[PDB]
From a paper:
The trefoil domain is comprised of three loops (foils) formed by three disulfide bonds. Using a combination of ELISA, isothermal titration calorimetry (ITC) and tryptophan quenching assays, we demonstrate that the cognate ligand for all TFFs is the GlcNAc-α-1,4-Gal disaccharide.
Initial attempts to co-crystallise the TFFs and their cognate ligand were confounded by the exceptional solubility of these proteins. An alignment of all mammalian TFF sequences revealed that all [name] proteins utilise a disaccharide-binding Asn, while all TFF3 proteins retain an Asp. [name] operates in the low pH gastric mucosa, while TFF3 does not, which suggested that a ligand-binding Asn or Asp may impact the pH profile of the lectin activity. The structure also provides insights into how [name] might bind H. pylori in an α-glucosidase sensitive manner. The core oligosaccharide of many H. pylori strains bears a Glc-α-1,4-Gal-branch, while the N-acetyl group of GlcNAc-α-1,4-Gal bound to the TFFs is solvent exposed and makes no interactions with the peptide. Clearly, the Glc-α-1,4-Gal branch of H. pylori core glycans could be easily accommodated in the TFF binding site.
Author numbering: 1 to 49
Write the structure that this text describes.
Amino acid sequence: QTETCTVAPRERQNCGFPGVTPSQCANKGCCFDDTVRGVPWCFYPNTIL
């Protein structure tokens, strides 16, 4: 792996859309988390090393 879903919520950039599902987020190669408010559910991953 070269990408990680460990992103600070205030740094998460929107990768999806209103009502995006994990499957639609996985199709785009992005990360999903709806347990944090005020941030996009589907966001881009962070680069490692």
